[PDB]
Short mmCIF file of C-alpha atoms (C1' of nucleotides) and ligand atoms in Angstrom, two decimals:
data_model
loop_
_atom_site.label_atom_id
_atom_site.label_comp_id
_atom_site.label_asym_id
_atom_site.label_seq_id
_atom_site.Cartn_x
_atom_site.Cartn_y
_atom_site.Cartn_z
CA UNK A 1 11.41 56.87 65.13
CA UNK A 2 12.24 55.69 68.76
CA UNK A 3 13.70 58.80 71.17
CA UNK A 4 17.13 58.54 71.75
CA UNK A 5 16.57 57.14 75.80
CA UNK A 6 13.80 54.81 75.06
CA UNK A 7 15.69 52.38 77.16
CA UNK A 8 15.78 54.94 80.05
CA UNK A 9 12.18 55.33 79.43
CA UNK A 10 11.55 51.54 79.36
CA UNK A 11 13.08 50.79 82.47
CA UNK A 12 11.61 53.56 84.41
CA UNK A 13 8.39 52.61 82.97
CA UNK A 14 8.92 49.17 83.89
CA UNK A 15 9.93 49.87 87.41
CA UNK A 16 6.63 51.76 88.50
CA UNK A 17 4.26 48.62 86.69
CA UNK A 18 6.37 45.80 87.60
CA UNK A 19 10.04 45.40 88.11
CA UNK A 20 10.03 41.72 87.67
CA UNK A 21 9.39 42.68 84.12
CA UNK A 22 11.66 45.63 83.72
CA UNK A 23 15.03 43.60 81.94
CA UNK A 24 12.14 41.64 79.61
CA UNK A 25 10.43 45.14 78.66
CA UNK A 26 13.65 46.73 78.43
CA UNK A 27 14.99 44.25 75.49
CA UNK A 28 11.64 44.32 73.97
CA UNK A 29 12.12 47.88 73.20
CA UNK A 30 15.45 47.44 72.23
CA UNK A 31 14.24 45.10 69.86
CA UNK A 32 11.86 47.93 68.31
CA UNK A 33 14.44 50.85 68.57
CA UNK A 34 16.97 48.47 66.32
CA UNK A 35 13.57 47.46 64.05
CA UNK A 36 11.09 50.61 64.35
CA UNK A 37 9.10 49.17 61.76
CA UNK A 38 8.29 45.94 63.54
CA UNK A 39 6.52 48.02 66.24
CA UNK A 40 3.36 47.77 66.15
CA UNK A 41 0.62 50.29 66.31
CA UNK A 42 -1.08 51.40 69.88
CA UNK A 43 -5.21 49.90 69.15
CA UNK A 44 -6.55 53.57 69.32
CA UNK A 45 -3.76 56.26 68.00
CA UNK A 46 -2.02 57.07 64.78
CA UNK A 47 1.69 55.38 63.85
CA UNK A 48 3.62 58.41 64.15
CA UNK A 49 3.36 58.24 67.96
CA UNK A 50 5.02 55.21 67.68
CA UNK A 51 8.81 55.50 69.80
CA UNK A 52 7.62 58.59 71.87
CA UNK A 53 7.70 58.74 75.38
CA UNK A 54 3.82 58.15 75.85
CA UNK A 55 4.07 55.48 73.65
CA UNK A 56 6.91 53.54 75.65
CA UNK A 57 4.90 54.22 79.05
CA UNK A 58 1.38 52.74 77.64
CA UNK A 59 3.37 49.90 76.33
CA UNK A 60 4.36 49.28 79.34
CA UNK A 61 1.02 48.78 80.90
CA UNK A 62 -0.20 46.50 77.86
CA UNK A 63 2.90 44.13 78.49
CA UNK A 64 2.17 43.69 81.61
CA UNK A 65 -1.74 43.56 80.91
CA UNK A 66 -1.00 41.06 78.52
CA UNK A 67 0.31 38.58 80.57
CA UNK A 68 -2.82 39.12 83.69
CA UNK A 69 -5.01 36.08 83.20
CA UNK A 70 -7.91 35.77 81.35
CA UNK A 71 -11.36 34.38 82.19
CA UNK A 72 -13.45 35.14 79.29
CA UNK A 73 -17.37 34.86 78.91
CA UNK A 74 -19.36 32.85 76.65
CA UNK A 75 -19.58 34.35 73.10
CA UNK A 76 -22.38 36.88 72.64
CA UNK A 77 -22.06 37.01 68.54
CA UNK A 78 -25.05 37.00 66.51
CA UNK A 79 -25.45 34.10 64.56
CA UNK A 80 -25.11 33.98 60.78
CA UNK A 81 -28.82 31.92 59.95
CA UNK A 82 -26.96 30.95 56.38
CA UNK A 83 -24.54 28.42 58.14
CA UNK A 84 -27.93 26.88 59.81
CA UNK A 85 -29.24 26.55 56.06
CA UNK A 86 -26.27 25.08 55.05
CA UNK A 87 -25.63 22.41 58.16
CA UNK A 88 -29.68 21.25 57.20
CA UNK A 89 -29.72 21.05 53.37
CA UNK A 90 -26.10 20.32 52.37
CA UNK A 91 -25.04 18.42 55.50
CA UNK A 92 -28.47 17.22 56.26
CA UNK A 93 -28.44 17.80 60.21
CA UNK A 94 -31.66 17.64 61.31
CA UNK A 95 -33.74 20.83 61.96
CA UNK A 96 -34.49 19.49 65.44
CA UNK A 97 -30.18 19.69 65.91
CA UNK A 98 -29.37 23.33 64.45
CA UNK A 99 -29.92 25.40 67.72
CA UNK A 100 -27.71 22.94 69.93
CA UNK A 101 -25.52 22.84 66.90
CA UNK A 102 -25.34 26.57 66.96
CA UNK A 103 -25.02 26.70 70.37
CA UNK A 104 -21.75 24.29 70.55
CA UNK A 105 -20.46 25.83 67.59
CA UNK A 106 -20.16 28.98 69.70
CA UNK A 107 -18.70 27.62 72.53
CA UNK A 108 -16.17 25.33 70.48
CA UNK A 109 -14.97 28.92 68.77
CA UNK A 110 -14.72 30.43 72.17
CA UNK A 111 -12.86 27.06 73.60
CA UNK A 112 -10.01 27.39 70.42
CA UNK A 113 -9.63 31.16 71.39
CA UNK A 114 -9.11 29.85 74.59
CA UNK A 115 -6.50 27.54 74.18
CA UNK A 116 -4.32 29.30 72.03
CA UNK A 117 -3.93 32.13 74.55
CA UNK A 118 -2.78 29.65 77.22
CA UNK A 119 -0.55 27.86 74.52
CA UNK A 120 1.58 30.98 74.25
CA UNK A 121 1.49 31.46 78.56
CA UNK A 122 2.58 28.03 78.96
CA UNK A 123 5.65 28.60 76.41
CA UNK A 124 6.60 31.63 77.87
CA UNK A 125 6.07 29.97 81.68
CA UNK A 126 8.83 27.68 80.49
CA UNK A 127 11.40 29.50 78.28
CA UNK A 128 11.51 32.69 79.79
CA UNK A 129 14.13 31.34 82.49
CA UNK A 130 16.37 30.09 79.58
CA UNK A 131 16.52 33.76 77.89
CA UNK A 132 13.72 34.28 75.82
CA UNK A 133 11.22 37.01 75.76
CA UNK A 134 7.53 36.66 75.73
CA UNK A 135 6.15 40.25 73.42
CA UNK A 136 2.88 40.19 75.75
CA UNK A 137 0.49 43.18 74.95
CA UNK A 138 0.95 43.30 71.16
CA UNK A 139 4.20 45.74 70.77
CA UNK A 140 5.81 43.32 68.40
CA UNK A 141 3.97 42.85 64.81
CA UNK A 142 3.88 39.34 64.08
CA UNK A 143 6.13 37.85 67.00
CA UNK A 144 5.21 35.89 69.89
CA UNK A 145 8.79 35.46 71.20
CA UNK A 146 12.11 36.84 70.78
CA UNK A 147 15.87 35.83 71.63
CA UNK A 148 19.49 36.96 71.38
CA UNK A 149 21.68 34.50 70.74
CA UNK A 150 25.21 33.08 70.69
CA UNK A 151 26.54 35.50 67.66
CA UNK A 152 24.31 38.25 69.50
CA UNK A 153 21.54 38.03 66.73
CA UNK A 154 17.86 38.61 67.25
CA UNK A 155 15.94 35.92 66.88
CA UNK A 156 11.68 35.84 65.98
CA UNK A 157 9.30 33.70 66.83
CA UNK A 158 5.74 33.11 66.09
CA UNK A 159 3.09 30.25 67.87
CA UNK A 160 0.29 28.91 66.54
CA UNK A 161 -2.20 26.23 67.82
CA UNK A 162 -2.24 24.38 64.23
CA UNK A 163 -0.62 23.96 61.07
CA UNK A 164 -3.99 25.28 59.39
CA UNK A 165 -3.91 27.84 61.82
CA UNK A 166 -3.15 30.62 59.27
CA UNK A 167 -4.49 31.33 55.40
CA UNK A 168 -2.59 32.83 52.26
CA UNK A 169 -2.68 36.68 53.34
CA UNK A 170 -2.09 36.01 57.39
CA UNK A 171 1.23 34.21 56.65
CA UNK A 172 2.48 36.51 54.61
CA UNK A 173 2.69 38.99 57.62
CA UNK A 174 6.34 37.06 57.81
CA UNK A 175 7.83 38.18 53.79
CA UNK A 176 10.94 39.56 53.96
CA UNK A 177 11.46 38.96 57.52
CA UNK A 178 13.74 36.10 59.41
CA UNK A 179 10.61 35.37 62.21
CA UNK A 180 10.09 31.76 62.06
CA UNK A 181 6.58 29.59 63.25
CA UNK A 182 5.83 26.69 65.16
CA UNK A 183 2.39 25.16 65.65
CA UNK A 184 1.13 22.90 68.34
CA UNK A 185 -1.32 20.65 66.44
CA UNK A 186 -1.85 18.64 63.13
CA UNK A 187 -5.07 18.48 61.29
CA UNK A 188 -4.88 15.93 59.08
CA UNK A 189 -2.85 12.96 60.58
CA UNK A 190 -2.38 12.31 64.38
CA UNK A 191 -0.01 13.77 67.31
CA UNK A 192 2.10 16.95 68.18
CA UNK A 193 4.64 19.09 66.81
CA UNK A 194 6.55 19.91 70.27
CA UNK A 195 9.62 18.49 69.74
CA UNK A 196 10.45 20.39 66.53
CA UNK A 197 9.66 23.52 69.04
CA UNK A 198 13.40 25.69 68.11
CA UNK A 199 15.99 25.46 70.67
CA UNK A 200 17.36 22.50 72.71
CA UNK A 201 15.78 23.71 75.86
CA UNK A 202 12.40 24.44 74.75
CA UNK A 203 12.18 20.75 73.13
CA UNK A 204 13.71 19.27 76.61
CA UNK A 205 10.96 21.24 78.59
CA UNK A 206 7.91 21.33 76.67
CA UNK A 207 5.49 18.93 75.87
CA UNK A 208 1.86 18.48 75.11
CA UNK A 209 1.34 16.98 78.79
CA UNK A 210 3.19 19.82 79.89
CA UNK A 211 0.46 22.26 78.03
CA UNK A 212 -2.36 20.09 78.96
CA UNK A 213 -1.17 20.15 82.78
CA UNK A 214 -0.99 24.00 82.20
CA UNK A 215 -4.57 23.83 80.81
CA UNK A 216 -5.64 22.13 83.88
CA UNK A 217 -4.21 24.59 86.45
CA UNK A 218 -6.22 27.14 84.60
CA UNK A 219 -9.49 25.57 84.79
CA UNK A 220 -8.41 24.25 88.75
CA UNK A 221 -8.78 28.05 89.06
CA UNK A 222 -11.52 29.25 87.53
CA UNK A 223 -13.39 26.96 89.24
CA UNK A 224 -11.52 28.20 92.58
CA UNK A 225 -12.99 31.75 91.40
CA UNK A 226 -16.17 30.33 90.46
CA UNK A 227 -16.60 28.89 93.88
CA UNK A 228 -16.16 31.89 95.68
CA UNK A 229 -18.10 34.29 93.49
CA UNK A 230 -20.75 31.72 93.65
CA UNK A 231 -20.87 31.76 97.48
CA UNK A 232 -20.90 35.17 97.51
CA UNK A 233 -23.81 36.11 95.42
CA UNK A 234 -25.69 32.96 97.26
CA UNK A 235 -24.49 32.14 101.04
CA UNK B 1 6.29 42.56 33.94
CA UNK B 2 3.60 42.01 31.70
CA UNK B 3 4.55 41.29 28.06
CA UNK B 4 3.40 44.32 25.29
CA UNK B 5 0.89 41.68 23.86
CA UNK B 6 -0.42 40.59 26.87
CA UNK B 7 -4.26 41.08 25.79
CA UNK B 8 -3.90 39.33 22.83
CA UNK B 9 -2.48 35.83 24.29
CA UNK B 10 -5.12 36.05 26.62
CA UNK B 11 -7.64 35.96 24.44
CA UNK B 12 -6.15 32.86 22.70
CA UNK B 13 -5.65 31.25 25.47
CA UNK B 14 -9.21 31.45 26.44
CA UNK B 15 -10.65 30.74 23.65
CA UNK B 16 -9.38 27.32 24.18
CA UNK B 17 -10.29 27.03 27.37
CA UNK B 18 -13.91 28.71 27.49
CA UNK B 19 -14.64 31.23 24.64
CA UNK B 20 -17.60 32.89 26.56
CA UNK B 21 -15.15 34.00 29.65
CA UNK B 22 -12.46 35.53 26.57
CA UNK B 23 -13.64 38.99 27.46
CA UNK B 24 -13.60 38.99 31.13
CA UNK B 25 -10.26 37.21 31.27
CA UNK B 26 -8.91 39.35 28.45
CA UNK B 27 -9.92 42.41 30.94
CA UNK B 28 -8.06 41.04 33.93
CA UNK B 29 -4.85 40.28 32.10
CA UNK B 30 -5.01 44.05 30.90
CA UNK B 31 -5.68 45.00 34.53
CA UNK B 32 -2.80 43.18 35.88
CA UNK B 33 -0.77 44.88 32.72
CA UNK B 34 -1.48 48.17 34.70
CA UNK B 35 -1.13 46.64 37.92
CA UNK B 36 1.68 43.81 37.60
CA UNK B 37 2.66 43.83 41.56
CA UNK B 38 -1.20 42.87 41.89
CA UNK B 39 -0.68 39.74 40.13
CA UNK B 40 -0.33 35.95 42.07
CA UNK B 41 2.85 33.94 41.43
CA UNK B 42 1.63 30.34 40.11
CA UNK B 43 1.87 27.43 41.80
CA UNK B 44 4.56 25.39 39.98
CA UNK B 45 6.65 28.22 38.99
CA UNK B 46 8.86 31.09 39.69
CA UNK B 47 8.26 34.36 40.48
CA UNK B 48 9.63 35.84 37.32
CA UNK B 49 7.33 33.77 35.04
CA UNK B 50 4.47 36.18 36.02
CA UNK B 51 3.69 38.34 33.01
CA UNK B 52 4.92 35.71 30.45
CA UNK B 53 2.70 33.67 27.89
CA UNK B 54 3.06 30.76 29.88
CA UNK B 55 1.68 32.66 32.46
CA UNK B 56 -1.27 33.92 30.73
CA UNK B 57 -2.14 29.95 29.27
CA UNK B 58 -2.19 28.64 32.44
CA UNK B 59 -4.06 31.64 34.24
CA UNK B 60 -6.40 30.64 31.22
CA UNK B 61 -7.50 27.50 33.01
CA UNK B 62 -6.83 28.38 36.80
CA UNK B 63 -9.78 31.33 35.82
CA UNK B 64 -12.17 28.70 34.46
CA UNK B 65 -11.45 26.38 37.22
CA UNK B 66 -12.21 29.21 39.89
CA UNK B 67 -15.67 28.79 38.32
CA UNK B 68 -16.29 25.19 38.90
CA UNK B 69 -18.86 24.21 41.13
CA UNK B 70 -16.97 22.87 44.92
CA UNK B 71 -19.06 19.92 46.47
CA UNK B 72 -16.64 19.83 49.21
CA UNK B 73 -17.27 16.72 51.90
CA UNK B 74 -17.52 16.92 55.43
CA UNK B 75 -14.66 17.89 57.48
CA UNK B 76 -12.35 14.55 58.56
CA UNK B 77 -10.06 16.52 60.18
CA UNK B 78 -8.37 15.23 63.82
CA UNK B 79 -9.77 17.38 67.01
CA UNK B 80 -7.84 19.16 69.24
CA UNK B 81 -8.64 17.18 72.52
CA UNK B 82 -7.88 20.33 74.57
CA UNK B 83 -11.04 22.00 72.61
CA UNK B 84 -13.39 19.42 74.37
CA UNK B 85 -11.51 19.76 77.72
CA UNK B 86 -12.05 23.26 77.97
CA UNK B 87 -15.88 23.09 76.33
CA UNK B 88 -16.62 20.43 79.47
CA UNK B 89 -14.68 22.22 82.02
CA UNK B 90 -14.63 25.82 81.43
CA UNK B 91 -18.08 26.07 79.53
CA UNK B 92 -19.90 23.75 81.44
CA UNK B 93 -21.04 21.09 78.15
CA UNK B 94 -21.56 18.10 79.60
CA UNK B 95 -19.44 15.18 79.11
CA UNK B 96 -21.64 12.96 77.00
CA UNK B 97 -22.19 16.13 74.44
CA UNK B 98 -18.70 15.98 73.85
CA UNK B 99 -18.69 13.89 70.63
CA UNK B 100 -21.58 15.88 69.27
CA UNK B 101 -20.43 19.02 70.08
CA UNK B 102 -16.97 17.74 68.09
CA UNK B 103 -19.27 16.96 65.32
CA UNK B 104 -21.40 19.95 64.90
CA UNK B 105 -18.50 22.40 65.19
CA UNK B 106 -16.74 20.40 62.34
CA UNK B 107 -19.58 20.47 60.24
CA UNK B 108 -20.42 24.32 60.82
CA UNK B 109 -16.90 24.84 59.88
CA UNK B 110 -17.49 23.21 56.49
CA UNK B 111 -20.80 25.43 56.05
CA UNK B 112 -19.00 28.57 56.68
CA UNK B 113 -16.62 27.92 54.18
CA UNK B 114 -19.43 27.03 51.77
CA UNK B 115 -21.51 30.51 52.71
CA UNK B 116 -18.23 32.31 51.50
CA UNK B 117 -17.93 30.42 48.51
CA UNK B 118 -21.65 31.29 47.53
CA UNK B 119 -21.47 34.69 48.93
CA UNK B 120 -18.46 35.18 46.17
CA UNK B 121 -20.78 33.34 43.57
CA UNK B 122 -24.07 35.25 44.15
CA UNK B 123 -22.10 38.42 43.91
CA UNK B 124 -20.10 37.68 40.60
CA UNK B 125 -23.91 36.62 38.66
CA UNK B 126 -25.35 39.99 40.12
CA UNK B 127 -22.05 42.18 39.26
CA UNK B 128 -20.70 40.77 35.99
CA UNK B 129 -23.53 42.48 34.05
CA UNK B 130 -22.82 45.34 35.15
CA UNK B 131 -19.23 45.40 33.91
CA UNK B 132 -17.07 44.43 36.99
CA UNK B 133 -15.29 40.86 36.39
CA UNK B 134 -14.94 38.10 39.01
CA UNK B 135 -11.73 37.36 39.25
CA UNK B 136 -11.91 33.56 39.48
CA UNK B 137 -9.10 31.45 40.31
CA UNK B 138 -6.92 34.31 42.16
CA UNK B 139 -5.16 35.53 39.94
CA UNK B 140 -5.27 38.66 41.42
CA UNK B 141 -3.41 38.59 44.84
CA UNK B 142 -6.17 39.81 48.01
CA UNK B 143 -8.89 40.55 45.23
CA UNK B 144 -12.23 38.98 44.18
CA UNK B 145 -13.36 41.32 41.87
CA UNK B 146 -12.51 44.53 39.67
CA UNK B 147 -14.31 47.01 38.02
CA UNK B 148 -13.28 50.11 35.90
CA UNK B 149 -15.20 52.98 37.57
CA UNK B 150 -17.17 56.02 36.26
CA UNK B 151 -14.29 58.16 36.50
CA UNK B 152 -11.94 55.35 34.07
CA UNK B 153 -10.25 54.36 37.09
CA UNK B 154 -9.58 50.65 37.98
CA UNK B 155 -10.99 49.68 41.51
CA UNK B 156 -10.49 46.44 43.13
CA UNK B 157 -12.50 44.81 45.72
CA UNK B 158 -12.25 42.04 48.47
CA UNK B 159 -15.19 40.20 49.83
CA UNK B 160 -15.68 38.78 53.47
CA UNK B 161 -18.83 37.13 54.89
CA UNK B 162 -18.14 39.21 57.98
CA UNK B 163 -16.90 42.17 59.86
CA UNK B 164 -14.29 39.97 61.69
CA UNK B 165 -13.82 37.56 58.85
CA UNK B 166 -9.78 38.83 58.94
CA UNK B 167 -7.44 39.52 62.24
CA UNK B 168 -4.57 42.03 61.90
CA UNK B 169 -2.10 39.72 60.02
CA UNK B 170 -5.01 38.77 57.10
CA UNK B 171 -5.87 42.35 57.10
CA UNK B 172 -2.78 43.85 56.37
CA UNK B 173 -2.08 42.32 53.28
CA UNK B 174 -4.46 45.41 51.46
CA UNK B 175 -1.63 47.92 53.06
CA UNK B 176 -0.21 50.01 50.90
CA UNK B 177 -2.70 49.43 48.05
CA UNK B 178 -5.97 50.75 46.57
CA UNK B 179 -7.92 47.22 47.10
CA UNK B 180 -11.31 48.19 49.34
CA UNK B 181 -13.17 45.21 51.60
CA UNK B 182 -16.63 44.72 52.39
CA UNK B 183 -18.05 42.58 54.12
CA UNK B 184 -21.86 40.76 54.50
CA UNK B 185 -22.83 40.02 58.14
CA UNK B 186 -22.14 41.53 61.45
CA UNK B 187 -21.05 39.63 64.62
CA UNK B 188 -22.38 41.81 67.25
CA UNK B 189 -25.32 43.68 66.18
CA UNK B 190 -28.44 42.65 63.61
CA UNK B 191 -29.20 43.09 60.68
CA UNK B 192 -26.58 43.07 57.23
CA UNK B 193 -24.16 45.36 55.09
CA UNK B 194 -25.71 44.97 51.82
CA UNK B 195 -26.29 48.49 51.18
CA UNK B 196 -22.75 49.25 51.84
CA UNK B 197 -21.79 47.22 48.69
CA UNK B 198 -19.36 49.53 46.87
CA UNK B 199 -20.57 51.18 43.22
CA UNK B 200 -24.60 52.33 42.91
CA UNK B 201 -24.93 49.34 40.65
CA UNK B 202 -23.82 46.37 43.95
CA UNK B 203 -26.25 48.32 46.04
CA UNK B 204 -28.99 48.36 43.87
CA UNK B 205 -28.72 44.52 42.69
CA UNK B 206 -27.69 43.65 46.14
CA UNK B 207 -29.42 42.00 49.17
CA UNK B 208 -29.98 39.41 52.07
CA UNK B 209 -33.12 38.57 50.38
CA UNK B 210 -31.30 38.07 47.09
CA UNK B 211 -28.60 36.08 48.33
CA UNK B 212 -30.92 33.53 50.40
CA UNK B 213 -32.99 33.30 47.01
CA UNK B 214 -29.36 32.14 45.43
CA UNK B 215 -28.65 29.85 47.88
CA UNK B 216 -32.23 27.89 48.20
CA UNK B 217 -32.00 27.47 44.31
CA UNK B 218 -28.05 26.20 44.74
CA UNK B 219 -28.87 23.48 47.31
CA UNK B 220 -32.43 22.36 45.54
CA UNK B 221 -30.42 22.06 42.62
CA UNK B 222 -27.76 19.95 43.91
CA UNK B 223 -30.54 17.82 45.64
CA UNK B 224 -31.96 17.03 42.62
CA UNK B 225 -28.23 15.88 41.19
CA UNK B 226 -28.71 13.71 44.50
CA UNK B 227 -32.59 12.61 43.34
CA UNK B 228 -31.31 11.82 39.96
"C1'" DG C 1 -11.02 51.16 63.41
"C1'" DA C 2 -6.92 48.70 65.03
"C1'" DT C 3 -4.28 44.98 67.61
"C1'" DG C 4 -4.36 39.90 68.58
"C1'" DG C 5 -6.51 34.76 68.97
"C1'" DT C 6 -8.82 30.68 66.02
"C1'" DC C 7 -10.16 26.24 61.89
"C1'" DC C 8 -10.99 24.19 56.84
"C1'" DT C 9 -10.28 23.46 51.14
"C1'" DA C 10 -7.97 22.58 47.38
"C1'" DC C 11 -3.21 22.42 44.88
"C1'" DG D 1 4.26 24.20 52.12
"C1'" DT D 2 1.14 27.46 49.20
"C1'" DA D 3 -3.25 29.93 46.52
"C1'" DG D 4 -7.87 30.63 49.02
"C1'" DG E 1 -12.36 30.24 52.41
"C1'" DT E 2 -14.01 30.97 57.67
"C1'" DC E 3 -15.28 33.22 63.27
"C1'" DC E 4 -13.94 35.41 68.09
"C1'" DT E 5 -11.55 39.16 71.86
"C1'" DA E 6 -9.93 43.28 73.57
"C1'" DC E 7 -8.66 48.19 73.15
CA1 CA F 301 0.71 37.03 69.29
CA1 CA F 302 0.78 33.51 68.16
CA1 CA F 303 -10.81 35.26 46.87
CA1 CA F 304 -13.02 36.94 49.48
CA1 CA F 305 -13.63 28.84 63.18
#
DNA sequence: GATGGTCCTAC
DNA sequence: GTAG
DNA sequence: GTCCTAC
């Protein structure tokens, strides 16, 4: 399925997006050209374009796009009225509480999305210098992270904010593979998973202070870019 | 996988469970008889007991239980402090709306779990009549329902209360099969799918008026459990 | 559409 | 952990 | 069982 220079492609691709990235991107695809069926799809175009040349080059772009920071907006999703009828006459909030209720509802949903795209930034922040491989821009079904190790065998990794994080038919995206999962958070008793994290040095080097210092770097900066779109719309 | 007298021990089997579900199950087992990759491993057991008597006894109860009315309690779940952090700091909600916020959110969780679990319900007293089966305690693995089509061909169906109900990893589990998805609401425009209900007979029987009827009648019934 | 992110219920 |  | 983002 992969051409038989993807590598040559990779690196070339690599070099003209950013060459900081190029050894990263390059292993990525070598990854994929050992296990074509892990790649997966481009968003818009059919599977069978999947190893080619064009493929390997807009790959490229998305690993690098996935890693750019994101400042998303408020969500702009129309609200299911059902949940409100449920909240008032099962749950009995008061009708007086269901638009706020709606309202932080919304912006709790958008705060999770939030927070588990800057949990898998603030992994990769810290592994990456001991050999692992953030799979930024999608190119890897089911795989955060990857890793060769000592007997020079592939390693899989998947990071999630919870341990309720997935349901029955998301977690099976894993049968009959070797990628394992970590999560973050517990929901039914108190504390955090990080020391269980796999690998000596990602245990030694993360921590949920470390994450919630990375968390407040992020918002240090969007108010930063805040301020100054602020001023210039109003100076 | 499934035993040659598979039909038969299901009807058995729910006959001393529920005799007026003996049908319906009886149906299922013989769709899973046609379609034995379809069918859930239980809970306790092995793989390889799928398909076996035992298998069809217990699926007996686990099909009736599917049934049961949930009267789940409010979330008690821990919060993710960083959720609040973010909500104050990112999206502006000021810091004594925290705790409410952390309330409300848990509690619309629990209400969107309940909508689902009604949306399910509403459909299967619509559908059942007209021949499709609800199949109750998931038995059948990514399915809610089946129905033998006008053309004798077994079709089965999964139902979402929205179009981005799954993500790519919940979605795939349909992949190389015939099960179809449908969904009720829409996230980012107005108005609902009803109409899109698969089978003349869903579309027909149907709608956002019907299903708000359902629901009204649930919840006064359940506070007048509560009044009594 | 597809590719990702997210939480809760019962067993 | 696993069926939703 | 559930909702949101970006392409
Ligand atoms: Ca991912
Ligand atoms: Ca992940
Ligand atoms: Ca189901
Ligand atoms: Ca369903
Ligand atoms: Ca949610």
């Amino acid at each position: 399925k992969f051409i038989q220079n993807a590598a040559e492609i990779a690196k070339k691709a690599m070099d003209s997006v950013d060459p900081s990235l190029s050894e990263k991107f390059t292993i990525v695809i070598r990854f994929l050209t050992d296990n074509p069926d892990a790649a997966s799809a481009l968003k818009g175009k059919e599977r069978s374009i999947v190893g080619t040349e064009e493929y390997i080059i807009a790959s490229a772009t998305n690993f690098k796009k996935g890693r750019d920071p994101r400042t998303p907006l408020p969500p702009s999703t129309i609200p299911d009225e059902m949940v409100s009828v449920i909240l008032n006459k099962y749950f009995e909030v008061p009708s007086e509480e269901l638009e706020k209720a709606e309202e932080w509802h919304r912006l709790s949903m958008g705060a999770e999305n939030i927070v588990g795209d800057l949990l898998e930034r603030y992994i990769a922040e810290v592994i990456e210098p001991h050999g692992w491989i953030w799979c930024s821009g999608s190119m890897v079904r089911a795989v955060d992270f990857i890793y060769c190790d000592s007997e020079n065998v592939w390693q899989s990794l998947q990071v999630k904010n919870r341990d309720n994080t997935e349901n029955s038919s998301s977690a099976a995206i894993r049968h009959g593979t070797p990628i394992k999962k970590w999560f973050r958070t517990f929901s039914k008793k108190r504390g955090d998973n990080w020391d269980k994290f796999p690998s000596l040095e990602g245990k030694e080097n993360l921590s949920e202070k470390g994450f919630k210092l990375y968390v407040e770097k992020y918002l240090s900066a969007l108010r930063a870019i805040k301020a100054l779109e602020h001023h210039h719309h109003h100076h």
